[PDB]
Each structure stands twice: as structure tokens, then as C-alpha cells.
Design a protein around this ligand. Structure first.
Ligand code: CYC
Ligand code: CYC
Ligand code: CYC
Ligand code: CYC
Ligand code: CYC
Ligand code: CYC
Ligand code: CYC
Ligand code: CYC
Ligand code: CYC
Ligand code: CYC
Ligand code: CYC
Ligand code: CYC
Ligand code: CYC
Lengths: 172, 274, 162, 162, 162, 172, 172, 162
């Protein structure tokens, strides 16, 4: 598994080199913003259930097809599987966000996922949408939390978004 | 479990199997709901001959579906050697043919157009060959004649689906794999409304065909080399299409004429509408 | 690759669980400790080569028969491959410093070490003595928590070789 | 019992390696974090009495019907067992604060929660609402990293109940 | 899907064995029982409309507050999704009656029930009370072994929800 | 696994409906003929060994190549495998016959079977024939039995053959 | 698993015959040369480590790219894997040499090996070369050992070579 | 296929190990023994015709009733398939002699024997009596270690059938 430092190290090694002063300071900045990062990961963990629930309510509000017999979130067994997958993806997105690298998300979650769903008959476009809704709400929480020091988290909100967007793209 | 080494331990014939599993065989040890890894949706495992009957029975019970069984040792010898066909030898028919110049062409058109199946002597299109010899028709003209023949209709069309026919058609007539899902669809709709014959014409009067083969050149392989407006994944399709020098199109297979290019694979190169 | 971040994530994942206050507290340690780590890293980075030539020579001075003909500290190629090897170690030490864990050392030098050294007739003693020397000199390039970090990883290599 | 210290030790043991510098910072995180944690702990400890009575009442104010006869917020014994239960939660929150991890919560309240609540006809909604209220008031007893810690664990309980 | 027939076949298959007198005796039970089962099924089928409206209302009469604004028994969509859900239960009860086992209930309502209800804030108590009411009225639509069958499956759902 | 009732239920559910009076009475009829069905399954169980044996004797009477060296029912190991497969298929046909549905046969036995045999070099046409012989003999026994009340057991006899014919078709 | 006798037996059986006087004497000759064969297998076993080591030293002498970063025998982990594979192949070649048949080599080692290496990114041409070097040194030892009775081992040296050459061909 | 050579190789492979002096000593046994084995093989090979007719008849002489009508020693096809079967046994005995182990017998006659004989109503007693007779006559075709070898394998078949 990689994190943002480990990634630097692998690229350096492929040159046969000690880390460039370029790469060093990029990583010094990561350490600089790490308290914000911890709050951002904490924002997701602290509202995981609601993020999934709210995404869910809204997914089925939009797409009643899945809720009706013949639909991929019917009966209870399938809805529980769908709720479970929403959690799994939100979980690996939070891991990527602590790590500063998408690899755990791509390697443990996204790799093969689309082909799984197609084999199952699970409508990937609906799954992509459920991921887009989790993103909206998750970022909502990253941006408006309990008594965190005021500052600018937009860099981290972007990065979190790209992890949500990776997952969506990979699946649709 | 994936791609294997070796065959046997005490001695066996290893077969590698492939399935699609429920969370009944493999699940994570997590707090909720049983799920298998998404990327092991179809999983494959190599089992020596005795454990094999027991494994298949188990898999089928706990819900999986066997997709394939194939001996391991078949599957260890790689992918085809393509040296003969990366860059082929072109054969072209000149204006005043020499009597055996024309002999060269016929043997090659046969091999290439019919996809290396044997055409027995009772079988050959003799009247049509008469025509090429006298110059009444040209090499492309003759190539069209073989395609509309029963022998071509019979080994490649009548017994397989349209998806397969078109995929063979690209290989034979154009020498390259089929690039898009649209190509398959565009063709199937033509056959449906203008018939078999109109559809056959559509590869032989195409701009792509005309550039490369012109009119006096026997269609030759050209998909193992980069081409224009070819998606990138059409170079892996060519391996699926051609199985080596001793491989052939063959409708005599035990399982019948079937595909070779996964439908899922085609979609990776793009999906639109129409 | 073992870092504080990867470790806590691994532990969460394996219990099917979101990161919680236990895991985020851990991460803060790694981030709070980056400044000392990265100061050690910069000092070790700029003052580099001579450490290799110093340790290479010391292997021959401690094992004189080494630099004699017919021996493995003789000729340009042995002495070249030696400098390179110590340089590999220092390189991975800096990586481990920057990464926040032993991962780079574990994956690129420790995994397989003995098998390789045994096939190629390379004595660990040389490498321990190269590292003991590097440890002596790093005593005056650093101090405080940067020195402790440098030491942690040098010692880690010496234990890997014993 | 899950703490940063027990987690890193568990990971070493299962792996047989000496506690080394990658691990030491994990531990340093837990130790560096103790001050904020323990401030939250002391504030939650001395306000316990009122935090509990505040949350108990709020369960009845949000679910008015509970306090009518024939219901589960009626009579001395139900209302007594309720105060006790919220008190159990606050107690384990302080323990989790002091311990440096969710262990006390995981072992004494989370493991088995749903089975118990389901057999006894206890709705999680009450308990979430008790905790949401406790979270509102703890906004003005603490601030900065002690508040973040208090929040971390209160929210952890709310997610355990959803 | 669990029926007497599938169960005995499963048990034979798993021992690599033809069906024997033990298994065929079992099957005869399921076939002998079909008449009572299917009478219950027909009665529950034609009364479905009113059984559902009766139970839906009873959920509001037993939990009056549900029908106030801001609550989950308010507005067309909640009240619509409720009728639907009880209708799902009665539907699977008839299926279980016709099938000769709990399979349809196990596969389409029980597997996953709690996770779903917990994510969507649906209290089992409502559903138990819907079913208790349906059980009261089915007392006078059926009698003898058809009633016992209807009861068996209604009670099975109530235990699944406790 | 499906039986004839379970099949009805799945189709009803896909409509979102309680079973049609159409489907109800089709199933009432299956219950009506169930004693005959039990006798039919019992006919096969009670003569399983002879059904396999007699099919076998006749298969090798016809195809004397299988029992020569080079042949797929030679030496003892292969003959035992072939005898075992005859039993396995007869077994799943009897299960389908108790169930009133082919699914257990198709899902647990026939699915992948042809491709197994081709991988093995087992001549599928010979296996198909062995199945045709089992069918002849299996259907034979049920008709004349020891002391059963006289009536028409004929309609029941047709249910077996399609299961034997499914297997044959699937394999050849 | 086959040895040279077992191979004879399988071919005889496929005729339905007792071994031909032809085949009998071919096998009598294998017994005739078996002391030499034992010395030949012993030559490899007794110098396995040096055969691998010397092959190795020379492989990386020629292909200094493998031991650079980016190279397939870098870092220590990969070099140990490469040294291990050299041993595995030398091991199955010695087994084939005791057996008088290549089958154990082809079935347990060479089958699938090329496709493994390609999946891994391991340069097969370099692996083929490492096998060619093992061959040179191994045969060296078969031909010039400790106080073995003087005679002609060229037949066995050839046969050993074909096992090394099988492996090389199979992999490149 | 079980021979001394395959056995020692199997045992080496399964421990990831080169053949050592233990395994090569074993192989020498198999090679030293080949002369006696192969003499037995040649004698059994050229007498095959009569050994088979002798044993076939002896099955009828010991089980007189077999040759009456309606029985399994009657008609050309039974008596033909019998000669063939004993011929199969002698064939595999010679193979086992030549191979240096029971492999050919284990793989081509023993694996599956009882299942086949049981489905086809073939009594082992016949086959034991065929082999007992073959053993009687082989007493005067061979002697010394070739006889011991012939005996070893004939007896091996008789034990396989008991
Ligand atoms: C237990 C694991 C752990 C956490 C969670 C942690 C958080 C943490 N967040 C901090 C700051 C902060 N955190 C934020 C975060 C935000 N600002 C906003 O306006 C957004 C809504 C939000 C975006 C994510 C900001 C702006 C600061 C102040 C600037 C800084 O220190 O970088 C600080 C520095 C002290 C302070 O200023 O309060 C700490 C220690 N430390 C830890 O050890
Ligand atoms: C590596 C982490 C990981 C992921 C991501 C994962 C996905 C995954 N989702 C699955 C099923 C499923 N996934 C869903 C999800 C949905 N249904 C819908 O209609 C929605 C569009 C969507 C929810 C947003 C459903 C309904 C099933 C069950 C399909 C079935 O059995 O019919 C399965 C089959 C095994 C099972 O059902 O447990 C896997 C492996 N498994 C994993 O181990
Ligand atoms: C549409 C149906 C059809 C016809 C009728 C046909 C005739 C035809 N006859 C040809 C040649 C020929 N035809 C003959 C025929 C004869 N030689 C003699 O001396 C006899 C008088 C006569 C036989 C009775 C010969 C010898 C040639 C070869 C001429 C050469 O190449 O020198 C050719 C030149 C191409 C070739 O050699 O294959 C054509 C096109 N082709 C056709 O496709
Ligand atoms: C051998 C004879 C033969 C068959 C049977 C055949 C099937 C076939 N159907 C296709 C597409 C299609 N088939 C359908 C059919 C349907 N869509 C629905 O929603 C309905 C459920 C269903 C109609 C009842 C649709 C919509 C496509 C286009 C898919 C796309 O491009 O997105 C394609 C892809 C090529 C193309 O679009 O022309 C093939 C090969 N092709 C053949 O040559
Ligand atoms: C690259 C050079 C090359 C080779 C080697 C080659 C082999 C080859 N042999 C084939 C068929 C065949 N090969 C045989 C051969 C045999 N049948 C037996 O029983 C014997 C054991 C054996 C003869 C010794 C038979 C009978 C078929 C036809 C199979 C069928 O259609 O049923 C086919 C299928 C196409 C066709 O039937 O023409 C190919 C491609 N093709 C090639 O292009
Ligand atoms: C990524 C981390 C990594 C390490 C640590 C590493 C060690 C390493 N040292 C090697 C050789 C060597 N190492 C030395 C070492 C020395 N010679 C001397 O003068 C001194 C006594 C001593 C230095 C202290 C020598 C002489 C060789 C050549 C051995 C040979 O091929 O005979 C080789 C064999 C391949 C080669 O010849 O380069 C490896 C793999 N390789 C790696 O990839
Ligand atoms: C160590 C951690 C721990 C927890 C959290 C815990 C919960 C818990 N609450 C219980 C009962 C109870 N819990 C309540 C709760 C309430 N009543 C009200 O007025 C409110 C609605 C609500 C408070 C918000 C009630 C009324 C009972 C009595 C249930 C009964 O026995 O009928 C019981 C059953 C044993 C008993 O009767 O005491 C357990 C185990 N037990 C533990 O050991
Ligand atoms: C196949 C078997 C099956 C069952 C049993 C089932 C239950 C079920 N009930 C749901 C929602 C619901 N269920 C209710 C239930 C009620 N509301 C009231 O007025 C009453 C209090 C109560 C009826 C007693 C409500 C209000 C919702 C909407 C929840 C939401 O999305 O906020 C949902 C979420 C998807 C959706 O919104 O439809 C499921 C899956 N789904 C199934 O597929
Ligand atoms: C799910 C239930 C199930 C089925 C149906 C099944 C079939 C099956 N038949 C097999 C072999 C076999 N099957 C046969 C059957 C025959 N040989 C002939 O010549 C005849 C035509 C035919 C008998 C009528 C033979 C001879 C083999 C052994 C092939 C070999 O190893 O060479 C094997 C390989 C494993 C083994 O040998 O045990 C499987 C999996 N396995 C299963 O678990
Ligand atoms: C232990 C498993 C089990 C078995 C075996 C079983 C048999 C069984 N066979 C029955 C009837 C019968 N069974 C037969 C069968 C036949 N009639 C003929 O003339 C043919 C020779 C034979 C064709 C298969 C007939 C004709 C009846 C009467 C009609 C009927 O009940 O359907 C009955 C109804 C009672 C009776 O009339 O005797 C039972 C219970 N019940 C069981 O629970
Ligand atoms: C059946 C007996 C058997 C063989 C033969 C075998 C080969 C084999 N070699 C492997 C890796 C490897 N093999 C090598 C070998 C080399 N690298 C080079 O640059 C050289 C050209 C070459 C040495 C001469 C390397 C470097 C790897 C590791 C590749 C990686 O993980 O990146 C792996 C992947 C699993 C692992 O790394 O342990 C297998 C299965 N495995 C077996 O079980
Ligand atoms: C422990 C297992 C075992 C071994 C290893 C073994 C070896 C062995 N090698 C022998 C002969 C021999 N071995 C060789 C071998 C060679 N000649 C050469 O010049 C080459 C360098 C080398 C090629 C491989 C030769 C030439 C003979 C004498 C001829 C013969 O007996 O065949 C002999 C016969 C006695 C003798 O002449 O010394 C034995 C017993 N016996 C055993 O039981
Ligand atoms: C490769 C090793 C091998 C063996 C050993 C073997 C035995 C064997 N004996 C068989 C039949 C037979 N075996 C006999 C044996 C005898 N009849 C007599 O007159 C005597 C009593 C007796 C000889 C002592 C008879 C009569 C049959 C025909 C059984 C039948 O089909 O009814 C069959 C059934 C297939 C067939 O009909 O040929 C097998 C497989 N098959 C093999 O492949």
C-alpha cells in the first residue's frame, strides 16, 4: 500500500536517487496541512452513517425503479447489499484521504468492481450516482463541522472529491 | 489461482477452473452482510484431476457457476507466435499473368479468405478461377466471389450468430479486428434490412479496404501493426482472433463456431448510440 | 509500505471499519514528528558520499586481507560495488526517515538479504562495520530527535544483519 | 482493549518484531494527545451529574409520549434505569478519552448492543438523542482539541447506534 | 428457497445419495399439508386490500404521534410506503403458505431486514403491531389447520422482528 | 434451488403480485398428482443400481471402442468414473422429478458439464447415449410394479423424459 | 509422473501389448548405464550451490541492467527470487536426469512458466540465459568429478543438455 | 506412476530439495533389481498365451457351474472377455516387473476395481483363482529372484482382490 510519502520514495528509487529538494518540500507541505487532513478524515468518520443514509434516501428518491420488484435494490437482501457497498466505498475514500494517495482505493476497492457489477446485473450508473451523492454530503461535512478552527480546506475538499470522482468514473 | 505454473505434483493433469462466486465461497470477515471481493468476480483455480470432481460439485452447490474447464498444460504455452504474420508477404496479380503467377494467387486467397480451413478439391470454385485466369475479373473481384459462395456461407455464416460472422468478416476481408461495438451494430442492422449480399459488399467496397488492398492485392494480415483510427485495444483482440499458424477458422469444433471476442471487451473501447 | 498512516489504515480495513479517534491520534504523532525526521533527512541528504568512501575503506582497514589480491576488497569493481551498496543502505535510511517507518528498508533491503549475501559470499560483518562507522560520524551532524531518528534506522539495519 | 499502545503491540507480536521507531511515534501520538483527551475527561467527569439529567430529560422532551402511563419512560424504575444507562455511556466516553482509543466503548457498550436493545425493546433513537444533547452542551464546557476529542467519542457512539 | 422439497433434496445431494423413504415421507407431509396452506393463501389473498388498510391504520392508532407533522407517518409518501411494506409482508406470507416453507420470507424479507430498518429509521415495533393486528382479524377469516398455518407464518415474521 | 411452487412464486414476485388463480390451480393439480410423483421417484431410487448397470452393459455392447485400450472407459479407473457419472446424472434427474422443476439438474449437474468432458477428452456423444439408455430403463420400471391400485399413472411418466432429454441435449 | 520405463509402458499399453523386444532392450541399456547416470545426478547435487552462484555472477556480469534500479534482479527481494528460480530449475533438471524423462520438468516447472514471467515483467530472455549458464557449468561438473571411474559420459551429457535446452526454449 | 524413481523424486520435490545420497541409494536398488525383474518379465511375456488359457480354464474347473447355460462362463463373449481380463492382469504384472514398482497395477487395475466388479457382477474369487493358478505354473518357468519378483506382483493382485 502507498501513501503520499511512499509514492515519492518509489519514484525517487526508480531514478536511483535520494529524494529531490523538490519532492522534500512537497512532503513538508503535506505535514504542514496534516491537522486539517485529520479533521477532514474525522468529518467523514463522525458522520459515516448519515452520509450513507442521506445518499441512500436521495438515490431512491430519484430512481424508484430499483425500489420496485425487478429492481436491483429490492428485496431487503439486495438493499442491504447496496447499503453495504455504499459504506465500503465511503470507507476506502476516507482511507485514501488519510493517506494522501488513491492507491488503497484503486487496488482494494475499484479494481474489478465494474465487471463484478455487470456480472451481477447491478446498474453501474445508479451506483455511480450513489457515489456522487455521498461526495456532496461528505464534503458538506468536511466544510461545516463542530468547533474546528476557522481556515481554508478547499485543497483537501478537492482532493477528497477526486477520490469520489475516481470511484464514480471507475464504476459507471 | 490466476495464471499458473507447472502441471502436476504426484502426477496429475491440472485443470484450471473458472467460476462466479457467491459470498458462500469467500467473504470478508467483516461485520456485515457477506460479500466477495469485487475483482474476484470470476475466479479461477487450478486443481489436479482427483480433487476435480469434488471441487466442481462444491462450487455448484454453494451457488457458483462454472464458466470453464481447460487443461492447464494447454494454457501454459502462451499466446501465439506472430512472426509469420506481423508483416506478411504480399501477393499481387499482374496485368499479363504468367500461368503460375495466377496459381500463386488462388492458393493464397484461399488460405486467407477462408481462414485456413481446408478447402478440398471437390470444393474449390473452379468456374470462378477460370475467370481470374483470363483477366475478366481482378483479384479483388475474385475475393468478393468467394465470400458470397455457399462454402463461405456454410462454414461461417449459417451456423453461428451474427456477432461472430461479422467478427470473422473483419478478420478475413480486412485483416484486422473489429474496433468498436458500433461496428458490430452497424453491420448487424444492415444485414437485417438489405440481406446477406449487401452486407458482404460493405467490407469489399469500403474505403479502408480499398486503400490497403487496392484491387490486385490479396487481403493480408495487418492488425498486428498499428493502423489508423484503430482503438488501442484492437491489438489485443487480434490475439484473440488469430490463434497461431496451425489455428484456423473451423466450424467443426466440438463446441461449434463461437465468438472469440468477449462482448464485454468490445464495450471497453466506447459506447454510444445507434 | 510500512508508515504510521498505512499501519492504522491497514488495521481499520482489516476490521471493516472507518478510521476512529484511536487511529487519527496515531496519525497526528507521525505528522507532529515530521519536522525532526525531515531535518535529519536534509542533513543526511547533503552530507552523503564521503560516508560511503569512509565506510568502504574501513571495511578494508578492519579486514586487511580484504584489499590484498585474490580478495573481495580488491580491484575497481569490488570496491565500486561496495560504495554502491553502502549508498543503497544510506538511501533507504533516508527513505525510511522521510516515510515514517521501516517499510523502505523492509521491502528493498531486508526481504531477501541473507539469501543474497550467502550466494554472493558477502559477510554481514562488513556491512555492520560500515554502519557502525556511519553511526559514529552522524553523532556530530545531528543532535536531539533528528539524531535519535538517524540512530533508530541505522541500528535497525545492524539488527537485520545479525 | 483497543488503545494506540495495544494496537501497535498487537501488530508487532503478530509480526514478531521489536518495537521500533515506526511504532514509537505511533505511541508518541497517543502520549502527545493525552493532555487534550484528559481535559475533556475531567470536564465530562465533574459535569456528569447534570449532563446525565439534561440528556435524560431531553429523551422525554423529544419523545413526549414516553412519559405517559403504560410507556417506557414512566415510573421510577424506567426513568431510573435510563439515567443509569446514559451515565454508563458518559462513563465509557471518559474511559475512552483517558485510554487513548475506543476500546472501552467497543468492549463494554458496542459489543452486543443491538441484541440487547432489541430483546428489551429499547430504541436507539432515544440514545442518539441523549448523545446529541450531551454534544450540544459539551460545546461550552470545552474548546479546541479537548472538544474535538469529546466529539470524536460522542459521535462514535451515535454511529454505533445507527 | 427453503421448502420441504428443497430441504430433503439438499440433504440427499450433500451426502451424494438418492432420495430414500425418509425423504419421501417428508415430502408427503408437505403435499398432505397443501390443502390447509392454500386455503389460508386464498383467504389472505382476496382480503389483502383490507388486511393492509387495517394494519396500516393500527400502526397510527397504536403510535398516535407518528401522524403528526415532522414524523414518519405523515404525508402521502410515508403512508403510501407503509401500506406497500405491509402488503409486501402479506404477499410473502401467502408465498410461504403456497411454497410449503419459510423460504420466501427468509430470502425476500428476513435476509437483511435489520440493516435496512436501522439505516432508514424504521422501528420493528410498527411492523410487529401491523402483524399482531393482521393476526387478530385472520382469526375470523379462517379456522382449523388453515388458521394454524396463517398463524405459523405471521408469528414467524414477528419473531424475525424481535 | 427451485421446485415447481418456488418457480411460480418467483414469477409472481417479478410482477409484484399475489399468485394468480391461474397459477394457484396449476399448483393444486401438482398436489393432486403427488402420490403418483412419489411412486415415480421411488421407482428410480428402488432400481438405481440396475438402471445404471443395464444402461452400462448396453452402452459398451454398442460402443466396444470405449473398453479397448485408447478408449475412454478403459482401464478400471476410467470405467469407475464413467459408472459414477451415470449415477450422478440419474441422481439429479430423480431430484428434478421430486421437485417438478429441472433447475437442480441444470444448476448442479449440467452447468459446465459439456466443457468438462471436452477438456477431458471424454466423448460426449457416448455420454449422451448412456443417458438415453438410462431414460429407457428408468421409465420402464414405473409401469409395472407390485400390487398398486389400478389407474392411469401415464401422465406422470412423461415428466421424467424431458429431464433425461435435457441432460442428453446439454452434453452431446 | 513418468520415468523412462513408465514411458515405455504407457506406449505399449496404448497398443494393448506386452513390451516389444525392441523396447525391452532399450530399457536394458538404461539399466546398463545407470551407475554413470547416478554419478551424473550426483555431480549436479554435489555442486548445486556453486552451479547457481557461478551462473548468477556471470548473468549479472553480462546484464548489468538487471541490478540497477528499474532492473528485474533489484532490490534484494527480487535478487532472492531470481536466485530461487535458478535453483528450482536446476532441481527439476536433476530430477529429469535421474528419471531419464523430461516430464517432471515440463509438468511441474515449465508448464505456464513463460506466461508467469510475462505477467510479472520478468525478462524471459535473461532467464533463458541464466539457464544456458547453469547448463555450461553443470555439464562441466558432470564431465570432470572426484575420482569417478574413467569412461564416456557424452550420451548422458547430451541428455542433460536437452533438459537445460527444453527449459531455455520453453521460457525465452 | 509409482516406481522407485518416481517415489524418491516425489519425496525430494515435496521438500523442495535436490536428490541426495538417501534417494540415490534407493534408485540403485531399483537398477540392481532390474535383471531379475526383467527375466521374470520375458518369461511371463512369451508364455502369456498359455498362462492365460490355463488360468481361464481353471476358473471353470474350480467353479464348474459357471459354464452351464444362463451363467457368466457361458457363450463365446463371456469366455472371450475372461481370457482378455486375465491377459490384462498378466500384462500389468509384466509392466510392474519392468517398471520397478506397483504403479501400473495401481493405476490401471487396482484404482476402481471393486466398483467395476460390483456393477458388472464379477466375483473376485474367480480372479484370485486365475492368479493362484498362474502362480502355480510360474513355479517352473522361473526360480531365484525372478520367481520372487513374479510372486511379489501376483500376490499383490490377490491382496488387491481380498
Ligand atoms: C485526533 C486526531 C487529530 C485531529 C483531528 C487534530 C486536529 C487539529 N486541527 C487543527 C487546526 C485546524 N483544522 C482546521 C480545519 C478546518 N477549518 C475549517 O474552516 C474547515 C471547516 C476545516 C477543514 C478540514 C483549520 C482551518 C485549522 C487551523 C489551521 C491549522 O492548524 O492548520 C489543529 C491545530 C490546533 C488548532 O488550531 O486547533 C489540530 C491539533 N489533531 C489531531 O491530533
Ligand atoms: C472490496 C470491497 C468490496 C466491494 C465494493 C464489493 C462489491 C460487491 N457488491 C456485491 C453485490 C451487490 N451490490 C449491490 C449494490 C447496489 N444495488 C443497487 O441497485 C445500487 C445501484 C447499488 C447500491 C448503491 C446489490 C443490490 C448487490 C447484490 C446483487 C445480487 O445478489 O443480486 C457483491 C457480490 C457479493 C455479495 O453480494 O456480497 C460484491 C463483491 N464487495 C467487496 O468486497
Ligand atoms: C462463364 C463460364 C466460363 C467459360 C466458358 C470460360 C472460358 C475460358 N476458357 C479459358 C481458357 C482455355 N480454354 C481452352 C479450351 C480449349 N482448348 C482447345 O484447344 C479446345 C478447342 C477447347 C476445349 C474444347 C484452353 C486450352 C484454354 C487455355 C488457353 C491458354 O491459357 O493458353 C479462359 C481463360 C482463363 C483460364 O484459363 O482459366 C476462360 C475465361 N471461363 C469461364 O468462366
Ligand atoms: C445472429 C443473429 C443476431 C442476433 C440475435 C444479434 C443480436 C445483437 N443485438 C445487438 C444490439 C441490441 N439489441 C437490443 C435489443 C433490445 N433492447 C431492449 O431493451 C430489449 C430488451 C431488446 C429488444 C427486445 C438493443 C437495444 C441493442 C443495442 C445496444 C446498444 O448499442 O446500446 C447487437 C450488437 C450489434 C448491433 O447493435 O447491431 C447484436 C450482435 N445480432 C445478430 O447478428
Ligand atoms: C500450420 C500448419 C497447420 C497444421 C499442422 C494444421 C492442423 C489442423 N488440423 C485440422 C483438422 C484435422 N486434423 C486431423 C488429423 C488427424 N486425425 C486423426 O484421427 C489422426 C490422429 C490425425 C492424422 C494423423 C483430422 C481428422 C481433422 C479434422 C477434424 C474435424 O473437422 O472433425 C485443422 C482444422 C482446419 C481443417 O480441418 O482444415 C487444423 C488447423 N493446420 C495448419 O494450418
Ligand atoms: C536495493 C538494495 C540492494 C543491496 C543492498 C544489494 C547488494 C548486492 N551486492 C552485490 C554484490 C557485491 N557486493 C560487494 C560488496 C563489497 N565489496 C567490497 O569491496 C566490500 C567488502 C563490500 C562493501 C562493504 C561485492 C564485492 C560484490 C560483487 C560480488 C560478486 O558478484 O562477486 C549484489 C549482486 C549483484 C551485483 O553483482 O551487483 C547485490 C544484489 N543489491 C541491492 O539491490
Ligand atoms: C455497561 C454498559 C451497559 C448498557 C449501556 C446497558 C443497557 C441496558 N439497559 C437495560 C434496561 C433499560 N433501559 C431503559 C432505558 C430507558 N428508559 C427510559 O425511560 C428511557 C426511554 C431510556 C433511557 C434513554 C429501560 C426503561 C430499561 C428497563 C427495560 C426492562 O427491563 O423492561 C438493560 C437490561 C438489564 C436491566 O434491566 O438493567 C441493559 C443491559 N447495560 C449495560 O451493562
Ligand atoms: C421485498 C420486501 C421489502 C420490504 C419489507 C421493504 C421495506 C422498506 N421500507 C422502506 C422505506 C419506508 N418504510 C416506511 C414505513 C412506514 N411508514 C409509515 O407511515 C409507517 C410508520 C410504516 C409502515 C408500518 C417509510 C415511511 C419509508 C420511507 C423511509 C425513507 O426513505 O425515509 C425501504 C427503503 C426504500 C424505499 O424508500 O422504498 C425499504 C427497502 N423493502 C422491500 O423490498
Ligand atoms: C456435479 C456432478 C458431477 C458430474 C456429472 C461430474 C463429471 C466428471 N466426470 C469426470 C471424469 C470422467 N467421466 C468419465 C465418463 C465416461 N467415460 C466414458 O467413456 C463414457 C462415455 C462416460 C460414462 C458414461 C470418465 C471415463 C472420466 C475420467 C476421465 C479421465 O480421467 O481420463 C470428472 C473429472 C474428475 C474425476 O475424474 O473425478 C468430472 C468433474 N463431476 C461431478 O462432480
Ligand atoms: C414413502 C413415500 C411414499 C409412497 C411411495 C407413497 C405411495 C402412495 N401411492 C398411492 C396411490 C397410487 N399409486 C399408484 C401407482 C401405480 N398404479 C399402478 O397401477 C402402477 C403399477 C403404479 C404406477 C407408478 C396408483 C394408481 C395409486 C392410486 C391413485 C392415486 O392416489 O393417485 C397413495 C395414496 C393411497 C393409496 O391409494 O394407496 C400413496 C400414499 N406415498 C408416500 O408417502
Ligand atoms: C514450479 C516451480 C516454480 C517456478 C519456476 C516459479 C517461478 C516464479 N518466479 C516468480 C518471481 C520472480 N522470478 C524472478 C527471476 C528473475 N529475475 C530476473 O531478473 C532474472 C532474469 C530471473 C532470475 C534468473 C524475479 C526477480 C521474481 C520476482 C518478480 C517480482 O515480484 O517483481 C514467481 C512469483 C511468486 C514469487 O515471487 O515467489 C513464480 C511463481 N515458481 C515456482 O513455484
Ligand atoms: C550412491 C548412488 C550411486 C552412485 C553415484 C554409483 C556410482 C558408480 N559409478 C560406477 C562406474 C562409472 N561411473 C562413471 C562415470 C563417469 N566417468 C567419467 O569419465 C565421467 C567423468 C563420469 C560421467 C558421469 C564411469 C565411466 C564408470 C565406469 C563404467 C560403468 O560402470 O558403467 C560404478 C561401478 C563401480 C565402478 O566402476 O566404480 C558405481 C557403483 N553407484 C551408486 O549406487
Ligand atoms: C485395464 C484393466 C481392466 C480390467 C481388469 C477390466 C475388467 C472388466 N471386465 C469386464 C466384463 C466382463 N468380465 C468377465 C469375466 C469373466 N467371465 C468369465 O467367463 C469368467 C468367469 C471371468 C474371467 C475370469 C465377463 C463375463 C464380462 C462381461 C460382463 C458383462 O458386460 O455382462 C468389464 C466391463 C466392460 C466390458 O464389458 O468389457 C471390465 C471393465 N477392464 C479393464 O479395462
Amino acid at each position: 500500500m502507498q501513501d503520499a510519502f511512499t509514492k515519492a520514495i518509489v519514484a525517487a528509487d526508480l531514478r536511483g536517487s535520494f529524494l529531490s529538494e523538490q519532492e522534500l518540500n512537497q512532503l513538508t507541505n503535506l505535514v504542514k496541512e496534516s491537522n486539517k487532513r485529520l479533521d477532514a478524515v474525522n468529518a467523514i468518520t463522525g458522520n459515516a452513517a448519515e452520509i450513507i443514509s442521506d445518499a441512500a434516501h436521495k438515490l431512491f428518491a430519484e430512481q424508484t425503479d430499483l425500489i420496485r420488484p425487478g429492481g436491483n435494490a429490492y428485496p431487503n437482501r439486495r438493499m442491504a447489499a447496496c447499503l453495504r457497498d455504499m459504506e465500503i466505498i465511503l470507507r476506502y475514500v476516507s482511507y485514501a484521504l488519510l493517506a494522501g494517495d488513491a492507491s488503497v482505493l484503486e487496488d482494494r476497492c475499484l479494481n474489478g468492481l465494474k465487471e463484478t457489477y455487470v456480472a451481477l446485473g447491478t446498474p453501474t450508473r445508479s451506483v455511480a450516482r450513489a457515489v456522487q451523492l455521498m461526495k456532496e454530503t461528505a464534503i458538506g461535512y468536511v466544510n461545516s463541522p463542530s468547533g474546528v478552527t476557522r481556515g481554508d480546506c478547499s485543497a483537501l475538499v478537492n482532493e477528497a472529491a477526486t477520490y469520489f470522482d475516481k470511484a464514480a468514473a471507475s464504476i459507471a | 489461482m490466476n495464471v499458473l505454473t507447472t502441471s502436476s505434483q504426484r502426477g496429475g493433469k491440472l485443470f484450471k477452473v473458472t467460476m462466479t462466486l457467491s459470498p458462500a465461497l469467500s467473504h470478508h470477515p467483516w461485520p456485515s452482510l457477506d460479500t466477495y471481493e469485487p475483482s474476484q468476480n470470476s475466479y479461477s483455480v487450478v486443481v489436479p484431476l482427483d480433487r476435480l470432481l469434488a471441487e466442481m460439485t462444491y462450487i455448484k452447490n454453494k451457488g457458483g457457476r462454472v464458466l470453464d474447464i481447460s487443461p492447464a498444460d494447454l494454457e501454459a504455452l502462451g499466446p501465439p507466435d506472430i512472426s509469420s504474420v506481423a508483416i506478411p508477404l504480399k501477393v499481387e496479380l499482374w496485368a499479363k499473368a504468367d500461368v503460375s503467377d495466377v496459381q500463386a494467387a488462388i492458393v493464397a486467397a484461399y488460405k486467407q479468405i477462408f481462414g485456413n480451413t481446408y478447402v478440398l478439391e471437390s470444393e474449390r470454385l473452379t468456374s470462378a478461377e477460370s475467370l481470374l485466369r483470363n483477366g475478366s475479373i481482378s483479384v479483388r473481384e475474385f475475393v468478393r466471389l468467394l465470400a458470397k459462395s455457399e462454402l463461405y456461407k456454410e462454414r461461417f455464416f449459417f451456423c453461428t450468430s451474427n456477432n461472430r460472422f461479422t467478427e470473422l468478416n473483419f478478420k478475413h476481408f480486412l485483416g484486422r479486428a473489429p474496433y468498436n461495438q458500433s461496428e458490430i451494430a452497424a453491420h448487424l442492422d444492415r444485414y437485417q434490412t438489405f440481406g446477406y449480399d449487401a452486407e458482404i459488399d460493405s467490407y469489399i467496397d469500403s474505403d479502408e479496404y480499398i486503400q490497403a488492398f487496392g484491387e490486385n492485392v490479396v487481403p493480408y494480415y495487418r492488425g498486428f501493426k498499428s493502423q489508423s483510427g484503430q482503438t488501442v485495444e484492437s491489438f489485443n483482440r487480434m490475439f484473440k482472433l488469430y490463434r497461431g499458424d496451425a489455428g484456423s477458422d473451423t466450424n467443426l469444433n466440438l463446441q461449434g463456431q463461437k465468438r472469440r471476442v468477449d462482448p464485454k471487451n468490445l464495450l471497453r473501447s466506447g459506447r454510444g448510440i445507434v | 509500505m510500512k508508515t504510521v498512516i498505512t499501519e492504522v489504515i491497514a488495521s481499520a480495513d482489516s476490521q471493516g471499519r472507518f478510521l476512529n479517534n484511536t487511529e487519527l491520534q496515531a496519525a497526528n504523532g507521525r505528522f507532529q514528528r515530521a519536522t525532526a525526521s525531515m531535518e535529519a533527512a536534509r542533513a543526511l541528504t547533503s552530507n552523503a558520499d564521503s560516508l560511503v568512501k569512509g565506510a568502504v575503506q574501513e571495511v578494508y582497514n578492519k579486514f586487511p586481507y580484504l584489499t590484498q589480491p585474490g580478495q573481495m576488497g580488491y580491484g575497481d569493481t569490488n570496491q565500486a560495488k561496495c560504495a554502491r551498496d553502502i549508498s543503497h543502505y544510506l538511501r533507504f535510511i533516508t527513505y525510511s526517515l522521510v516515510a515514517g517507518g521501516t517499510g523502505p528498508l523492509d521491502d528493498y533491503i531486508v526481504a531477501g538479504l541473507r539469501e543474497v549475501n550467502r550466494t554472493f559470499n558477502l559477510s554481514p560483518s562488513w556491512y555492520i562495520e560500515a554502519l557502525k562507522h556511519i553511526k559514529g560520524k552522524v553523532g556530530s551532524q545531528l543532535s536531539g530527535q533528528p539524531l535519535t531518528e538517524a540512530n533508530a534506522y541505522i541500528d535497525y539495519c545492524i539488527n537485520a544483519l545479525s
